[PDB]
Paper text:
To investigate if the observed distance for the NSQ forming L405E/C416N variant corresponds to a docked CTT, we determined the crystal structure of [name]-SORTC-SL. The protein forms a non-physiological disulfide-linked dimer in the asymmetric unit with the predicted positions of the two C-terminal sort-tags located in close proximity to each other at the dimer interface. Only one C-terminal sort-tag can be discerned in the electron density, with the nitroxide moiety itself conformationally disordered. The SORTC-SL linker orients away from the CTT and [name] and is, therefore, is unlikely to interfere with the CTT dynamics. The error values (χv2) for the distance reconstruction are close to 1, indicating a good fit; the error bar on the distance values are below 0.2 Å. c The crystal structure of [name]-WT-SORTC-SL in the dark state shows that the active site FAD and the sulfhydryl group on the GGGGC linker are separated by ~31–32 Å (depending on the FAD atom chosen). The 31–32 Å distance between FADox and the linker cysteine sulfhydryl group is close to the 29 Å distance found by PDS in the NSQ forming L405E/C416N variant. The small discrepancy in distance may derive from the unobserved nitroxide moiety residing closer to the flavin than the C-terminal Cys residue or the crystallographic dimer interface influencing the tag position to some extent. From the structure we can also surmise that substitutions at positions 405 and 416 are unlikely to perturb the conformation of the CTT on their own. Both residues are located on the opposite side of the FAD cofactor from the CTT and both E405 and N416 substitutions are predicted to be sterically accommodated by the surrounding residues. Overall, the structure indicates that the L405E/C416N variant generally does not release the CTT upon NSQ formation.
Residue numbers in the entry:
A (entry chain B): 2 to 548
B (entry chain A): 3 to 539
């Protein structure tokens, strides 16, 4: 704090590697400019506006990871300062203590962050402070791929692939930061109490966040932070290594597995614990210059396109929301079809949230969502269709707000886009087939021996495998013979699906004859894209049928 | 006149991409004439073990060349078709008009060695240039074998790795200009003494008649170069629709056994269509464009899902080069010696005639006798049922029957595919019932019974729910539709559940006896088996 100080404000991108904003904050070590790493609980940033217990713990685990790494490389001189209040109020009064030359941040391209960031930009113009903004949460610059497509984001996944190949490959991750020679600031102890500088790392209880509806089914647990994200990346980079030397995927690898352990990095990518560019260019360097022939779920393995294509799905949804604050709703949302959803049935909606629908796979997935906060992509498709076009004809907004609260990742743009991609695509009639919107048939495909169902629906523990997916088929004597009387211990089906899929298919067909014009909306590229999205494989598409 | 060059046709019955032909016209400005020659010596172009369908195909291609030679020369150019010994014909042809060069296309298969070396020792005597050019395969098989250390690659993945080192295959040559080419009209008595055909002969001239049934063949094929080019341009438009769509329709990815005469395997066997023209046409149509979809476990970028099929053809041609025992078990170093049962002429005849009691097996073998072409999934079914997945008979019996009635019937490809499927004892998926059961495959390929009812017409009155398993019908059902297990349709000539049971024991006993799996023709991995048999992958 001799000649001033630079601020690296953390919101997302809670990491030290591949942090251009951190490097720009460390670029004045020679001039004696100090470094101040800060995180502010302003009541919305890092997804704290609508958060449950599982994601708040994940965020606090990442803040501690940054805090422990700073001390491990600065002999204890480096400290992550966690505040709680208005960001513009904290930065102005902190400028009274030490001179702020540059305030470095990572670009949050989502429009819900525009108010927060433009107030800091307006503050720096008043105090003559450099406002440094770096793009590192996404692979490309969202404004660069939007202007390439003519000032509007691509609405289909293929239209996004066509534009990024024009721009080229995304930038490589930056080098690591050296903090052994960096100086920090010891400010006034009373100034810390006024601006609410935490002396200890807070807990979710400090923010009135306690155990959720189910508490916790401690079968799957996730430790946040940059250390665990890099530990899981190397674990997966070796699984791809074995499949790379093998040249093909084992049949058990290409199939969706819902009985596995916490290996997903979607929560580490949302908070920015793991760099998306480091994920991308680690797969690229491991696959380039080796031609392959086998595929993984209809996507080639040559060049790692089956892995890096997943990171483009995330980039494709992040950019569609940039200049659209109504992206989470349908009124005022220009790229979402207006579907006549039924009236809010909060009795059925509560049966969907609590996992009391009478359908085993739906209940087992929603109870895992409440307890553990993570669902497989196949299970997220099932509960989304069952709530919307597939089962109850409820608006996807009621499912988005529930997901954004209990999900570990819960990207405001990725989660909202996936709800519209699946529920509000009227001209993709393959989504109306019960062969893709039936949880009973899918239960036999993902959970053959009822291992997953009985693990998160414990009332079905003793029913034999011949009646797990269809408990209603048991006799009156058999129902009390396995401690499961449908309607008492296990709830009955809140709706008849076979008569519900008929109502919804005709109600959606009614929209198509009224809208012969297909307006620009978030939709699948083609029918082949639906089959890979819903992990169909053997019998999907036109002419595939039931073999 | 002064001299003449001979373009001798054996394979490569075409005018385009014919480097041997271009070498014959290379001395056009010297006053050296041209002599197109095809000799029925009793073995060339697969005429030693041939049926009526393939002989009809060969003669259709010879007429195409003769018709093309007249349209480009206003009647001056003709195709000379002889019948006799090639070295005797060429020697007496040399004293009528001096032969400077004898140009042929390379036949790398060892069954043609004694024929070519016979002509080779003749030209060194009479001081004639023996020009041999490679155009039947994508690469020179010697350059592929020598790159692999002097031995041919025994797995398909080992082959793709070797040709990747060599590089992309050569592109087809330019078309030949025959508008200013001179020919010779020989002495009429010389044409009488050398057995020169005036009219193109018929299959009946070679003691070849209309098979056993013959009339069930209404899906007929017409040989020739210009007609093979029509099939190439036809599929090129189908592939660009998928190229512009970005993916294959599900009905396209599924095998189709009730389709049209679409295949070009017979045209590529006789050389009516150039394989390099086939390769580089698909390569130019898919280049510079990145695709992400796949076709049955193989990518579509660069046309690898199409060009990879042509590499299967080269992979079997290259393996048989220095192995004259490639079509037999004894003395074949690349074939596992499997204890096959003693030859049973009753079950073998029921396999050929299609009287085994299994509907899909009967419909395929009866289609082979009439039309002489089967889908790859149907050739697999009748091959496993004859060998490891049924009767446990030697693959040598099925090879001779296939080399006789097939339209393609490449000596190296057909034998290689027979060993690849039958004698792969260490590929344990090959013995799974998903591959060794035609009943489940019948409901998978021909669901409603359309293909079975037309090639097994004794089952057309049987409804769909009993057409795949006619033995399951009751007493009044075998009479209401009149299909008794005995007089109308034969009983299953073997117990399939018991046969596959005892055959898997013999393969394990073979593996337990062979602690070393010696280098043999085998699949590369289990994934390669799924793609080969059109499985779920
Ligand atoms: C209703 C619904 C809501 C979803 N909400 C989210 C969300 O809030 N956050 C989120 O990251 N993903 C979301 N997804 C996508 C998908 O469910 C997860 O990305 C996936 O389950 C993560 O598992 P994984 O990393 O092991 O899969 P991988 O195949 O390893 O995915 C690699 C990465 O690619 C990205 N990705 C994968 N699939 C998609 C997709 N369909 N759309 C966008 N990005 C994708 C993620 O960042 C993911 O971590 C949602 C999908 C649905 C159907
Ligand atoms: C027991 C058995 C015997 C066979 N005998 C022959 C034969 O005598 N001649 C022959 O050309 N093919 C043979 N094959 C391969 C296969 O049956 C045919 O190549 C294929 O059915 C031709 O149909 P298509 O051209 O429409 O297929 P496509 O997929 O269009 O094939 C493209 C071309 O690639 C080549 N090709 C395709 N598959 C193979 C293969 N497995 N091995 C070698 N070349 C291949 C052929 O030249 C074919 O025309 C045999 C396969 C088996 C199982
Ligand atoms: Mg992951
Ligand atoms: Mg063909
Ligand atoms: Mg399968």
């Amino acid at each position: 704090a001799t000649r001033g100080a630079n601020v690296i404000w953390f919101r997302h991108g809670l990491r030290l590697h591949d942090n251009p904003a951190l490097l720009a904050a460390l670029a004045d070590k020679d001039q004696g400019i100090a470094l101040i790493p800060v995180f502010i609980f302003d009541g919305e940033s890092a997804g704290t506006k609508n958060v449950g217990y599982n994601r708040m713990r994940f965020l606090l685990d990442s803040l501690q990871d940054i805090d422990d790494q700073l001390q491990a490389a600065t002999d204890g001189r480096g400290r992550l300062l966690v505040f709680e209040g208005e960001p513009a109020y904290i930065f102005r009064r902190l400028h009274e203590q030490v001179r702020l030359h540059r305030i470095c941040i990572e670009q949050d391209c989502e429009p819900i962050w525009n108010e927060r960031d433009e107030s800091i930009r307006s503050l720096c113009r008043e105090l003559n402070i450099d406002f440094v903004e770096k793009v590192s949460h996404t692979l490309w610059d969202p404004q660069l791929v939007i202007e390439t497509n003519g000032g509007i984001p691509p609405l289909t996944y293929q239209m996004f692939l066509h534009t990024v190949q024009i721009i080229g490959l995304p930038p490589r991750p930056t080098a690591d930061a050296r903090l052994e020679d960096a100086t920090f600031v010891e400010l006034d102890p009373e100034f810390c109490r006024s601006l609410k500088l935490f002396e200890q790392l807070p807990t979710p209880e400090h923010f009135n966040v306690y155990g959720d509806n189910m508490g916790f089914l401690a079968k799957i647990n996730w430790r946040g932070g940059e250390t665990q994200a890099l530990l899981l990346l190397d674990e997966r980079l070796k699984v791809e290594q074995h499949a790379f030397e093998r040249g093909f995927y084992l049949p058990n690898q290409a199939l969706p597995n819902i009985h596995d352990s916490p290996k997903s990095m979607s929560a580490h990518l949302r908070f920015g614990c793991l760099s998306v560019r480091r994920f991308y260019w680690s797969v690229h360097d491991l696959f380039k210059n080796v031609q392959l022939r086998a595929c993984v779920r209809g996507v080639q393995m040559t060049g790692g396109a089956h892995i890096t294509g997943q990171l483009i799905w995330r980039e494709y949804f992040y950019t569609m929301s940039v200049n659209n604050p109504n992206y989470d709703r349908m009124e005022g949302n220009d790229i979402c079809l207006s579907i006549p959803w039924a009236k809010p049935n909060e009795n059925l909606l509560q049966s969907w949230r609590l996992g009391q629908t009478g359908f085993p796979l739906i209940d087992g997935a929603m109870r895992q969502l409440l307890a553990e906060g993570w669902l497989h992509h196949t299970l997220r498709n099932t509960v989304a269709t069952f709530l919307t076009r597939g089962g109850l004809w409820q608006s996807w907004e009621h499912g988005l707000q529930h997901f954004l609260k209990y999900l570990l990742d819960a990207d405001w743009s990725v989660c909202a886009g996936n709800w519209m991609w699946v529920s509000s695509s009227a001209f993709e009639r393959l989504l109306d087939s019960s062969l893709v919107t039936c949880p009973v048939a899918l239960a036999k495909r993902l959970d053959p021996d009822g291992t997953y169902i009985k693990q998160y629906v414990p009332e079905l523990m003793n029913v034999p495998k011949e009646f797990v997916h269809e408990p209603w088929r048991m006799s009156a004597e058999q129902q009390e013979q396995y401690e499961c009387l449908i309607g008492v211990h296990y709830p009955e089906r809140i709706i008849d699906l076979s008569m519900a899929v008929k109502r919804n298919m005709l109600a959606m067909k009614s929209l198509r004859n009224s809208l012969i014009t297909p307006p620009p909306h978030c939709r699948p590229s083609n029918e082949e894209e639906v089959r890979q999205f819903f992990w169909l494989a053997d019998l999907p598409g036109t002419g595939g049928g039931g073999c």
